[PDB]
Design a protein around this ligand. Structure first.
Ligand SMILES: *[C@@H]1O[C@H](CO)[C@@H](O[C@@H]2O[C@H](CO)[C@@H](O[C@@H]3O[C@H](CO[C@H]4O[C@H](CO)[C@@H](O)[C@H](O)[C@@H]4O)[C@@H](O)[C@H](O[C@H]4O[C@H](CO)[C@@H](O)[C@H](O)[C@@H]4O)[C@@H]3O)[C@H](O)[C@H]2NC(C)=O)[C@H](O)[C@H]1NC(C)=O
Ligand SMILES: *[C@@H]1O[C@H](CO)[C@@H](O[C@@H]2O[C@H](CO)[C@@H](O[C@@H]3O[C@H](CO[C@H]4O[C@H](CO)[C@@H](O)[C@H](O)[C@@H]4O)[C@@H](O)[C@H](O[C@H]4O[C@H](CO)[C@@H](O)[C@H](O)[C@@H]4O)[C@@H]3O)[C@H](O)[C@H]2NC(C)=O)[C@H](O)[C@H]1NC(C)=O
Ligand SMILES: *[C@@H]1O[C@H](CO)[C@@H](O[C@@H]2O[C@H](CO)[C@@H](O[C@@H]3O[C@H](CO[C@H]4O[C@H](CO)[C@@H](O)[C@H](O)[C@@H]4O)[C@@H](O)[C@H](O[C@H]4O[C@H](CO)[C@@H](O)[C@H](O)[C@@H]4O)[C@@H]3O)[C@H](O)[C@H]2NC(C)=O)[C@H](O)[C@H]1NC(C)=O
Ligand SMILES: *[C@@H]1O[C@H](CO)[C@@H](O[C@@H]2O[C@H](CO)[C@@H](O[C@@H]3O[C@H](CO)[C@@H](O)[C@H](O)[C@@H]3O)[C@H](O)[C@H]2NC(C)=O)[C@H](O)[C@H]1NC(C)=O
Ligand SMILES: *[C@@H]1O[C@H](CO)[C@@H](O[C@@H]2O[C@H](CO)[C@@H](O[C@@H]3O[C@H](CO)[C@@H](O)[C@H](O)[C@@H]3O)[C@H](O)[C@H]2NC(C)=O)[C@H](O)[C@H]1NC(C)=O
Ligand SMILES: *[C@@H]1O[C@H](CO)[C@@H](O[C@@H]2O[C@H](CO)[C@@H](O[C@@H]3O[C@H](CO)[C@@H](O)[C@H](O)[C@@H]3O)[C@H](O)[C@H]2NC(C)=O)[C@H](O)[C@H]1NC(C)=O
Ligand SMILES: *[C@@H]1O[C@H](CO)[C@@H](O[C@@H]2O[C@H](CO)[C@@H](O[C@@H]3O[C@H](CO)[C@@H](O)[C@H](O)[C@@H]3O)[C@H](O)[C@H]2NC(C)=O)[C@H](O)[C@H]1NC(C)=O
Ligand SMILES: *[C@@H]1O[C@H](CO)[C@@H](O[C@@H]2O[C@H](CO)[C@@H](O[C@@H]3O[C@H](CO)[C@@H](O)[C@H](O)[C@@H]3O)[C@H](O)[C@H]2NC(C)=O)[C@H](O)[C@H]1NC(C)=O
Ligand SMILES: *[C@@H]1O[C@H](CO)[C@@H](O[C@@H]2O[C@H](CO)[C@@H](O[C@@H]3O[C@H](CO)[C@@H](O)[C@H](O)[C@@H]3O)[C@H](O)[C@H]2NC(C)=O)[C@H](O)[C@H]1NC(C)=O
Ligand SMILES: *[C@@H]1O[C@H](CO)[C@@H](O[C@@H]2O[C@H](CO)[C@@H](O)[C@H](O)[C@H]2NC(C)=O)[C@H](O)[C@H]1NC(C)=O
Ligand SMILES: *[C@@H]1O[C@H](CO)[C@@H](O[C@@H]2O[C@H](CO)[C@@H](O)[C@H](O)[C@H]2NC(C)=O)[C@H](O)[C@H]1NC(C)=O
Ligand SMILES: *[C@@H]1O[C@H](CO)[C@@H](O[C@@H]2O[C@H](CO)[C@@H](O)[C@H](O)[C@H]2NC(C)=O)[C@H](O)[C@H]1NC(C)=O
Ligand code: NAG
Ligand code: NAG
Ligand code: NAG
Ligand code: NAG
Ligand code: NAG
Ligand code: NAG
Lengths: 317, 317, 317
């Protein structure tokens, strides 16, 4: 009689369909998903330092809009900007806004140091009803609106050396009055011109008098500029009117900081990978949640699912 | 005696040489080409909506050059710009020309709506011998050259609200006269200044009087600018001279539209993939016709040919 | 008794560890390194034409700084800029500096042709103590500082046609005086304005009078601009003061030329691939020396080492 000895392999009743080089649909005993397609819906507050902008854009927190005083000197790994954020100060624009936003986001700090600028012969600390704190007329916290003193505005020619070991970021502005009579009532002369320079750079800006549409009841504008001053260099401000003066400088650092637009709530939890949709697990190599990511994240791909076989071909009985 | 039974495989007299991981030249029984290397030489007019610019650049058709009146309100999937195209109106430049061209190309429409701007106290509809229609002096169809009325040009301070559900694109310009006497004869005052603003943006432009080389016998210039006005925002134009005024707005859409430089003829045929060389079949995954493509196109690669084996190794008798 | 016949394969005592799809560490009999991780430390002077900038930036050699007279009309495949390089002429800036540097680097030539500009009614060849040659006051070699003649500066309205078969690059500038009295003592009128145009382009620049920090004892500045003039086009310079005039044009070529920042010494040797660290062998497909490369170079990758098996699995006795 003898015996029979059969060689074989396992199978399962419930196999999984995968793709190969030669077949778009072949059943294997087991597979694992390589694309992360879901988020928790919230941004975990750990392990990255998250700063929720709430009502404030980064630039409003920089300039010191009345709703953003809580942000002074704060640092972040990720600044989260909300779609509802709105400005509540004097109407302004920033030529190159995207660049200033980027460079501050990347620096990751609003650390500010006051400096004693000698604004000889002018009135300091100008305020406006378009920028209230506690119903008092106010202004951007980090800027100094200079105006005439006893109907004179003598030329400014003011220096601030950088004797630090680090770079300084200066934010400053030019005021564009609505009319020629406004120009005279504020600055006591028919126009201005502002030149801000260092040993290696120069910027001159001309105020442009005229009407813009009313925003928070103001038809004038402020235009915001910035200047970086290296160790051993010197800031020189030379102006005859219309200067929205710096009060000091911001520290500028380098590191891993960034900014993200999201309306996702911040939660008490721990996740390395942040998207605008919320944090996502990062076990998988790929994800199709969002191209926008921050941290140790799977790579964004177009596919919904990619199944990696983890077993043999399934050949059921 | 018994029998002999031989196992074997086919071969062909005429095999094809392919590349593998271990051999740059191995003969197989059959192969297929994966790189499309030829075009028909013409651009098929289907299934994309093709607009042949003929003598007109997109920007000339936008502004309304005399040779481009046939283009009014036309739409396209692909605007085809010809190398022979030339301007036949007042000499102009567009700071950022590439961006205006891109944004209009991408929008895919020249749909224009006239609006009633109140140009109180000036002469409208200025014309020039450098921009003829039917030998009559004329001007860009979408722009309004304003000049003095009875040797006065009172300040303009004109508003146009956007109460639509869509964005409006405004095209406007500044006239740079050749001389101080030209400035006075056109605008009745020594210079101009133009500020165009919205609630969220502002542009001011200064005319610059002086000689440029003659183009179509004109040594002055026009510089072209644009402004996008969102729903609920308001256009404000404030100027004292030198304004080349808008007559209305263009619709701005988003979609699949673009622009291509080509001298290929347009034919009555159907092809999904367009290159400057002409339409190409899109059965193959790769092509080496042109990096510039539009539609469902193979991907551009450097290789002339890539042969995919579709049979076994060929081992002839 | 009979015989025994055993089939087998070789092995070595000293195998090499490689990575595969299924194992990060498997021993093979032999392998070869695919990542170049070392340089010689010097830049080989062959086979590319190397131009060592020594104390000169490319832009200083272009303008004709006193330390850069040896560079006149030189050509390069690779211009090497040293970190110690410094300027020793009148303090200047170049709006778009990076672009002018790039376009000259890419052109690969400082070939300069003088032209006879008719500067009727002004003093030519102005010099300064901030730009010495042999202790004599001097100026940038390729620029012409125009000033008043007998306390007059009549308007300039000067033409230079391009009747060549090639494009011309013109470099020119605007002088920004420190004070209103300086403006008058140099140019005999209260301000300037410079318009440089062609048939297809226009640039106007306004001088901006004021103090900048002293650099080589000068608080004024020069701002440098450029203009390309095509065959058949015409350069037109129209100015009333503050013009730092061109003396001629540079040739502009296209080809394989570039620029690199490096402090590596130049040696007498032959290597196709240049990095800032020095030349590297290019036998391997990859390298981790520097992302910055010039010539026939391996591709930059993050890995230190990638070992390609060149033998079987090593199974020692
Ligand atoms: C089909 O094939 C897949 C892939 O091989 C198998 O999935 C693995 O299953 C094993 C055994 O259950 C898993 O091992 C466990 O992993 C946990 C950590 O999870 C990591 O990866 C997952 C991915 O989903 C993430 O959730 C997470 O962030 C981690 O990165 C460990 O915590 C587990 O530990 C447990 O056992 C150990 C034994 O020492 C103890 O220390 C602990 O007490 C603990 O209880 C465990 O190691 C493995 O993660 C799975 N891999 C993947 C990729 O999912 C399936 O099991 C297989 N299915 C079938 C039916 O055969
Ligand atoms: C060497 O190997 C290649 C690849 O396997 C073989 O090429 C295939 O040959 C078959 C049979 O001739 C082709 O099948 C036919 O395809 C036509 C559609 O063409 C598509 O792909 C080509 C690519 O060149 C494009 O021109 C075109 O845009 C399409 O995307 C069909 O129209 C044909 O239909 C005919 O038969 C069917 C049968 O039902 C009928 O419905 C119709 O009446 C009609 O007459 C047909 O299906 C196939 O396209 C080829 N593939 C490729 C990639 O070229 C070679 O045959 C082989 N050579 C040898 C000697 O063995
Ligand atoms: C482990 O596996 C590797 C890869 O197979 C083997 O390395 C090869 O070894 C052979 C024989 O020594 C080498 O052949 C020689 O190449 C020289 C040119 O070098 C090129 O590549 C190297 C890469 O390091 C560069 O240095 C160089 O820039 C070149 O691009 C030739 O000059 C040699 O010529 C000599 O022999 C010929 C015979 O005709 C004569 O003409 C000359 O007189 C001359 O003396 C020779 O051809 C080959 O380059 C190596 N390849 C690589 C990638 O390194 C190892 O040998 C093997 N190790 C073991 C223990 O088996
Ligand atoms: C130049 O044109 C602009 C735009 O048309 C004019 O601005 C408008 O000025 C009026 C009058 O001051 C403003 O009216 C005010 O509206 C507020 C808000 O409702 C109200 O509280 C005030 O009592 C007053 O009615 C109007 O808001 C403003 N419009 C815009 C769009 O800014 C400007 O007056 C013109 N200048 C001249 C000199 O004519
Ligand atoms: C750059 O800073 C300097 C230094 O303050 C400014 O120059 C100074 O400007 C003032 C006011 O414009 C000048 O005073 C005026 O002089 C005229 C001439 O007699 C007189 O009529 C006026 O009543 C007034 O006194 C002053 O002379 C001048 N100083 C120098 C050294 O030139 C300059 O304005 C600043 N630039 C900018 C853009 O702000
Ligand atoms: C400032 O310089 C420019 C450039 O040299 C001068 O422009 C030139 O002006 C002359 C005289 O009007 C133009 O001549 C005309 O040429 C046309 C075409 O052949 C002809 O039909 C007319 O009868 C006349 O001869 C010339 O085209 C023009 N050149 C350029 C390059 O634009 C300008 O006159 C100078 N301004 C002053 C105030 O000197
Ligand atoms: C922005 O729009 C406003 C409103 O039209 C413009 O302001 C107005 O400009 C005119 C002409 O410059 C001023 O009239 C002039 O007043 C002087 C002073 O007495 C007089 O000598 C002249 O004969 C003439 O009548 C008008 O007062 C002024 N209105 C206001 C409210 O300031 C302004 O020019 C526009 N800006 C631009 C850049 O166009
Ligand atoms: C406007 O402000 C600037 C910046 O504070 C003033 O520039 C400074 O001017 C002084 C006086 O000319 C310069 O002093 C000189 O220093 C050199 C080098 O040590 C020395 O050789 C001279 O004998 C003299 O002491 C100083 O360098 C310069 N500072 C800077 C940073 O540029 C300018 O004077 C002010 N203008 C007015 C009208 O007040
Ligand atoms: C562009 O080039 C033209 C041609 O040279 C310049 O125009 C000319 O400018 C001069 C000086 O500004 C004018 O002469 C002046 O005329 C007035 C008016 O009577 C007189 O008071 C002065 O004493 C002087 O003679 C000349 O008339 C004028 N020519 C023309 C045809 O307008 C213009 O300045 C140049 N533009 C630039 C930005 O440099
Ligand atoms: C995460 O957020 C993104 C961005 O909003 C979502 O992608 C959008 O999905 C909508 C449909 O819900 C589409 O209309 C848009 O085209 C998508 N936007 C972009 C920018 O691609 C995405 O669905 C979200 N994913 C998850 C898993 O929540
Ligand atoms: C399609 O058009 C392109 C662009 O003109 C052709 O590519 C050029 O070919 C010429 C030689 O005829 C070269 O001198 C240029 O360097 C190429 N230009 C570019 C931008 O790469 C191409 O040959 C055409 N292809 C076909 C199949 O017609
Ligand atoms: C070649 O030069 C590069 C650039 O300086 C070197 O890369 C730097 O290495 C230092 C450490 O020595 C790091 O701190 C920097 O982050 C690196 N710089 C950049 C820009 O990546 C590199 O080490 C040199 N390689 C060799 C083989 O000499
Ligand atoms: C943000 O603004 C809204 C009103 O727009 C207000 O209800 C809310 O209290 C503000 N949040 C903070 C944190 O100030
Ligand atoms: C301006 O305000 C600050 C407080 O913000 C104060 O320290 C300073 O004395 C004020 N200066 C003047 C001139 O009013
Ligand atoms: C285009 O211009 C040429 C002359 O340059 C003319 O022959 C042709 O008729 C024009 N085409 C159209 C469509 O107007
Ligand atoms: C300007 O021209 C248009 C026709 O293009 C006409 O409707 C309008 O009445 C003209 N306006 C004036 C003020 O001449
Ligand atoms: C470069 O400058 C240094 C001083 O800064 C000098 O020692 C050296 O001789 C200069 N080199 C050349 C080539 O002129
Ligand atoms: C300017 O200098 C050059 C030499 O660099 C000389 O040829 C020319 O004659 C000088 N011109 C004047 C007007 O001084």
């Amino acid at each position: 009689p003898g015996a029979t000895l059969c060689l074989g392999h396992h199978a399962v009743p419930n196999g999984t369909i995968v793709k190969t080089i030669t077949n778009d649909q072949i059943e294997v005993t087991n597979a694992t998903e390589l694309v992360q397609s879901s988020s928790t819906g919230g941004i975990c507050d750990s392990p990255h330092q998250i700063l929720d902008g709430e009502n404030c854009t980064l630039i409003d927190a920089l300039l010191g809009d009345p709703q953003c005083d809580g942000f002074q000197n704060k640092k972040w790994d990720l600044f989260v900007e909300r779609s509802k954020a709105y400005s509540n100060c004097y109407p302004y624009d920033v030529p190159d806004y995207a660049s200033l936003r980027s460079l501050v986001a990347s620096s990751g700090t609003l650390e500010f140091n006051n400096e004693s600028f000698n604004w000889a012969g002018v009135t300091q600390n100008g305020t406006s009803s378009a920028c209230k704190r506690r119903s008092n007329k106010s202004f951007f916290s980090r800027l100094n609106w200079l105006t005439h003193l006893k109907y004179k505005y003598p030329a400014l020619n003011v220096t601030m050396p950088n004797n630090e070991k680090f770079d300084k970021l200066y934010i400053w502005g030019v005021h564009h009055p609505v009319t020629d009579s406004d120009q005279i009532s504020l600055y006591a002369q028919a126009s201005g011109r502002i030149t801000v320079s260092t040993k290696r750079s120069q910027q001159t800006v001309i105020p442009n008098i005229g009407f813009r549409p009313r925003v928070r009841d103001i038809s004038s504008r402020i235009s915001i500029y910035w200047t970086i001053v290296k160790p051993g260099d010197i800031l020189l401000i030379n102006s005859t009117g219309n200067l929205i003066a710096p009060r000091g400088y911001f520290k500028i650092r380098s590191g891993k900081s960034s900014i993200m637009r999201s309306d996702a709530p911040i939660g008490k939890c721990n996740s390395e990978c942040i998207t605008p949709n919320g944090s996502i697990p990062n076990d998988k190599p790929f994800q199709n949640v969002n191209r926008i990511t921050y941290g140790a994240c799977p790579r964004y791909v177009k596919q919904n699912t990619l199944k990696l076989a983890t077993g043999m071909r399934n050949v059921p009985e």
